[PDB]
Design a protein that fits this description.
This is part of a larger assembly, with two copies of chain A. Chain A contains one helix and no strands. Chain A is low in regular secondary structure. Chains A, B: It comes from Escherichia coli O157:H7.
């Protein structure tokens, strides 16, 4: 806040600015595809 | 003091001179005029 006051009028304590803290947590977006060894070995696509 | 002593009479004790202390205490004399910063800024004459 910014106060106005006057000539010869005492000055009140203005409220100090506030600070906010955003906690951006990290979280693992994992992929766990259980492919069989059958597909990898049999196919010529190299499915990995 | 000085005695007008004589011949037969003995010389009694004369009163010694007294010394006086003058205690001139240093006291503060002060002016504490509250001027508004407004008057300092706005006066055409150097108000301070």
């Amino acid at each position: 806040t910014v106060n106005h006051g006057e000539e010869g009028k005492t000055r009140e304590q203005t409220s100090t600015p506030q600070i906010n803290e955003v906690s951006i947590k990290l979280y693992p977006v994992y992929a766990y595809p259980r492919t069989t060894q059958e597909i990898v070995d049999f196919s010529d696509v190299d499915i990995l």
